[PDB]
């Protein structure tokens, strides 16, 4: 007994601010601004020069400002009944999915701020060499002066692997570690002086370098209404929930909320340059879609095409596909294919390269029965 | 420049309101509907 | 102005109970005359609800 579902892994919140100021309705706008100290210019002039005038420099403050923005919530209803009939199994029912999926909806929350933050350029780490790519990493970061402590760095399930194939580690010789850390275990040590943290939320192919003072969350515990019957403060890995089950009456309703006020702030500097983080994403230059050659289902059937890198990443929802047979066989966008007429068709993928240049295609048969 | 922050404060500055007298001067009485019996004047 | 004998001018006052509903907190009872305190949660809308009545 007992086939639980599989479910993913907080991680990403143990690594971020959480919470570095406590008040923000306060102020104006529940925004609060942070002063970042200024710096002074110098300035040079020859002796014995016949202008004894001087130039005044100049120290402006500028500063940066954190706004809670967003509420995650779970809403839910009780079927039809409130003590034995839905909650059966008090504390193990209901209310573990619910606190998992905000758990998990505060993960995606942090993943997007990551993600969507602008990195400007791409490094391209490639499979053949991943520690120059490191050490490209590690130039980024030496080059805005950021400082060298405080530096983590997360990585998808695709960085891994594509570390553990690195023929650096693997070796042993070439690592210099006698117990073979990359071949005996599937887990690698810190490389690069930042150490290596598994997180599948983030993209597999993409891995994201950041210093301590990179982003800001902010997560606010919202209090328990007067107004209702019930209420909780069940924490969630760190960050507390308001949850609340009042009996909205109306059409039976027994519907209950898990909230938490969540806030995002991304540091940028004085003009605006986001060079406190780096990002890396895998060259991928060979695809081919899973799986071979394949009839269909049926002369009316359908079925959704999957295509993978030669890393070993999913990329059907950047992938393309073309029908050359298209009265024979019609293909969707995201490459659900459909069998209209029985016969022999092709369908060809195409993938834009991270690298650039011209898009790598491949083209897979079909004999719709 | 220099940026500053903003203050908001409170030093005995109350809005005028009313005061509570009538209140109490009253003849109040607690709790449908409630009836008072009146008592009869005879005549001689 | 009005110069009356305490007999006369009189008031009732009945201080309803509260609903099913209610979740209530402590009394205040403003001058002299009791009053309670509701306070409901609707979970339709985004608001909380606070009446004080007699």
Same mark, same amino acid.
């Given at each position: ?61 500028? +500063? ?168 909780? +403060? ?136 | ?44």
């Amino acid at each position: 007994i007992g086939v639980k579902q599989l479910q993913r892994e907080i991680v990403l919140p143990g690594l971020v601010w959480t919470n570095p100021l406590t008040d923000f309705g306060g102020s104006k706008n529940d925004t609060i601004t942070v002063r970042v100290p200024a710096i002074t210019t110098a300035n040079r002039r020859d002796l014995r020069d016949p202008d004894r005038t001087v130039i005044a420099s100049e120290l402006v403050e500028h +500063s940066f400002g954190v706004t809670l923005d967003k509420h995650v919530y779970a809403a839910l209803k009780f079927t039809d009944e409130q003590r034995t009939l839905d909650i059966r199994d008090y504390t193990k029912q209901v209310l573990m999915p619910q606190v998992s999926a905000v758990a998990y909806e505060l993960e995606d929350y942090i993943a997007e701020l990551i993600e969507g933050a602008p990195y400007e350029e791409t490094i391209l780490i490639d499979p053949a060499d991943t520690v120059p790519a490191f050490i490209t990493a590690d130039q980024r970061m030496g080059e805005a002066n950021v400082p060298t402590d405080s530096r983590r760095l997360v990585v998808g399930s695709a960085v891994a692997a594509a570390l553990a194939k690195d023929k650096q580690f693997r070796h042993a010789d070439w690592s210099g570690d006698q117990a073979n850390a990359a071949l005996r275990e599937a887990h690698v040590g810190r490389l690069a002086g930042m150490n290596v943290i598994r997180s599948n939320a983030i993209a597999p192919d993409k891995a994201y370098l950041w210093h301590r003072t990179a982003f800001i969350l902010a997560y606010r515990t919202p209090v328990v209404p007067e107004g209702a019957k019930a209420g909780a +403060s069940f924490s969630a890995n760190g960050v507390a929930l308001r949850w609340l089950a009042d009996y909205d009456y109306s059409q039976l309703g027994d519907r209950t909320l898990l909230d938490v006020f969540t806030g995002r702030k991304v540091v940028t500097e004085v003009d605006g340059s986001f060079v406190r983080a780096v990002e890396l994403q895998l060259q991928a230059s060979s695809i081919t879609i899973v799986g071979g050659a394949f009839a269909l289902a049926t002369t009316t059937g359908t079925k959704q095409l999957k295509v993978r890198d030669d890393n070993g990443t999913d990329v059907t929802a950047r992938c393309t596909f073309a029908s050359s047979a298209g009265t024979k066989a019609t293909v969707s966008a995201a490459g659900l294919v459909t069998g209209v007429a029985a016969g022999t068709a092709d369908i060809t993928a195409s993938y834009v390269p991270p690298q650039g240049g011209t898009a790598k295609t491949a083209t897979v048969t079909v004999t719709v029965p | 420049i220099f940026v500053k922050p903003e203050l908001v404060a409170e030093i005995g500055v109350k809005q005028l309101q009313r005061e509570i007298v009538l209140p109490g001067l009253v003849w109040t009485n607690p709790l449908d509907t409630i009836t008072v019996r009146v008592p009869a004047i005879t005549t001689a």
